[PDB]
Amino acid sequence: DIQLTQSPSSLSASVGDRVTITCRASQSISSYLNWYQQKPGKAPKLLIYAASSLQSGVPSRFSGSGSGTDFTLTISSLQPEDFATYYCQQSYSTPPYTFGQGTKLEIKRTVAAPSVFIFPPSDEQLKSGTASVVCLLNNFYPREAKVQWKVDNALQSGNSQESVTEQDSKDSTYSLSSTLTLSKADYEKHKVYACEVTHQGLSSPVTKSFNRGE
Amino acid sequence: QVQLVQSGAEVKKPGASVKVSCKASGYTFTSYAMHWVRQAPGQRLEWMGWINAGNGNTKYSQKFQGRVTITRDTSASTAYMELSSLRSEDTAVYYCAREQWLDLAHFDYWGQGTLVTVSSGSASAPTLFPLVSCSSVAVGCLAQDFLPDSITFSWKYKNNSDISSTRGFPSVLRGGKYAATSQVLLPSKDVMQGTDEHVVCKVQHPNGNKEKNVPLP
Ligand SMILES: *[C@@H]1O[C@H](CO)[C@@H](O[C@@H]2O[C@H](CO)[C@@H](O)[C@H](O)[C@H]2NC(C)=O)[C@H](O)[C@H]1NC(C)=O
């Protein structure tokens, strides 16, 4: 089977930068290489076929070159909406129709600190027997952020989940939602609920909190 | 405008089978082969098989041989993929894709995808809870206890006009069911200087659409 290895696996770059991604095939595939783009929650989209042919409708900043075992996809002027995973794929010797493991491209931009909001559980939820406490971090860059839940100043562990949006198509920032899940009883055994956020754009951690009463 | 439109999300138990459809339009259906490619969440694209839309000939990946069937209805311009003996590792988004043969083969058009979820649990619609804070004010919506993970949020004012949506957050899995949050950011001064006391969060889900009034502080 022909294996495809993409390099790098991850890459951050600035708007306007020239970006180059490489795909190496375990054996010669002539020009039977295609490049696809895939954004979160969407289907792949053809960018390049036959190593260097631009698919109709694709912006001209995408180009490809190579033949044999080494191929390159180049974005000559990176745009904010180019955040995505890029796959190479060979159609010379099949099956299998081999895809690369993908190269994830993020847009590099200036540091932006998150704005933080905390939301207590609703009464309607509490009567169900479970309490969800939500903490939102909005419009920050880079993606790396730390959320620490605290209940009466006791650091929580193992009882929270979180997820991060895709990179915004205009301003290239992220948002993150974190949920701390307690039982109604445990929730009513404590008073102060807080999320503490650590991020490069903050000189010191930022804490948002409430008291179970109000 | 070449278009490939696939059937909706599916929830199945381990051991069951699933059949996904892919309706083609904008070209001569019989002139192009149709391939099926799946992607487990966060994973690699994985080719499964192709069918020649003209003469109905097929070829399958040896990984799926014996449990996958690809068919086509020419008069309906539709291709079908059936996968049996489903296991949890079959949970994935399944895509149909058209192959362009001209020059060097390549997949030039893709369907929007079909989420197939294999679970011991059962499908369920979401339950909505408001997120109220205790410059812009943040208002939110929590959808819980829904399956499959195929949900979309939208927001409306009291006067029934749309609120500009913000980046959606991925759902998280807990106890065999999914949960997701959504948020809108409203100017603070327009909220405190306003007669409206709530907005409306709406969710669309294959098992039941829901609405919830979200108070404003
Ligand atoms: C629908 O009602 C909302 C709430 O009163 C209105 O939202 C305001 O719209 C103005 C438009 O200039 C904005 O400046 C305010 O920030 C909005 N307020 C909030 C709280 O979002 C909206 O104008 C109304 N639309 C119609 C067609 O009546």
Residue where one domain finishes, among candidates B64, B88, B118: B118
Q: What residue in B sits closest to A103 (Cα-Cα)?
A: B44
Q: Minimal CA–CA distance to A84: which of A48, A45, A40, A42?
A: A40
Experimentally, the structure was elucidated by: X-ray
Domain containing residue A204: CATH number: 2.60.40.10
Cα A122 to its chain centre, rounded Å, is 30
Are B76 and B144 contained in the same domain?
no
Say if residue A124 is in the same domain as residue A82. Answer: no
Between chains, do B181 and A50 touch, taking CB under 8 Å as contact?
no
Q: Could B144 and A97 be called an inter-chain contact, meaning their C-beta atoms sit closer than 8 Å?
A: no
Burial of A201 (0-12, 13-18, 19+ CB in 10 A): middle
In a shared domain, residues A171 and A98? no
**Is-contact B140 B131, C-beta < 8 A?**
yes
Asked if B70 and B155 sit in the same domain, the reply is no
Residue-range definition of the domain harbouring residue B27:
3-118
Ligand 1 centroid from CA B141, angstroms: 20
Tokens representing B168 are 């959606």
CA distance A80 to A21: 17
Asked if B145 and B85 sit in the same domain, the reply is no
Same structural domain, A62 and A119: no
Q: Are residues B161 and B107 in the same domain?
A: no
Q: Do B55 and B16 belong together in one domain? A: yes
The span from the CA of B202 to the CA of B127, in Å, is 11
CATH number of the domain that residue B146 is part of: 2.60.40.10
Domain boundary among A67, A93, A108: A108
> What's the 3-state SS for B180-194?
EEEEEEEEHHHHHCC
Three-state SS string across chain B, please? CCEEEECCCEEECCCCCEEEEEEEECCCHHHCEEEEEEECCCCCEEEEEEEECCCCCEEECCCCCCCEEEEEECCCCEEEEEECCCCHHHCEEEEEEEEECCCCCEEEEECCCEEEEECCCCCECCEEEEEECCCEEEEEEEEEEEECCCCEEEEECCCCCECCCCCCCCCEEECCEEEEEEEEEEEHHHHHCCCCCEEEEEEECCCCCEEEEEECC
Residues B136 and B114 in one domain: no
Is A98 in the same domain as A133?
no
Task: Examine the domain organization and report whether B108 and B8 are in the same domain.
Answer: yes
Cα–Cα distance for residue pair B53/B51, rounded to 1 Å:
6
Q: A119 lies in which domain range?
A: 115-211
Assess whether A11 and A59 both reside in one domain: yes
Number of domains chain A is built from? 2
Residues B90 and B17 in one domain: yes
User: Which of A136, A161, A175 comes nearest B174 by C-beta?
Assistant: A161
Q: What is the CA(B183)–ligand 1 centre distance, in A? A: 17
B110 in A contact zone (CB under 8 Å)? yes
Q: How far apart are CA B49 and CA A127, in angstroms?
A: 50
In Å, how far is A202's CA from the nearest CA of chain B? 19
Q: How far apart are alpha carbons A159 and A161 in whole angstroms?
A: 7
Tally of domains within chain B: 2
Contact B180, B169 (CB under 8 A): yes
Chain A hits for B144, CB-CB cut-off 8 Å, are: 125, 132
Do A13 and A104 belong together in one domain?
yes
Residue that terminates a domain, selected from A108, A136, A159: A108
A10 and A95 fall within a common domain = yes
Pairwise CB contact (< 8 Å): B131 & A119: yes
Cα of B198 to ligand 1 centre, how many Å? Answer: 12
A36 and A93 share one domain: yes
How far is A159 from A181, CA to CA, in rounded Å? Answer: 6
- Residue B10 shares a structural domain with residue B114: yes
Query: Among B54, B87, B118, where does a domain finish?
Result: B118
- Amino acid identity of residue B94, one-letter, is Y
- Out of A108, A134, A162, a domain closes at A108
Question: Are B13 and B100 in the same domain?
Answer: yes
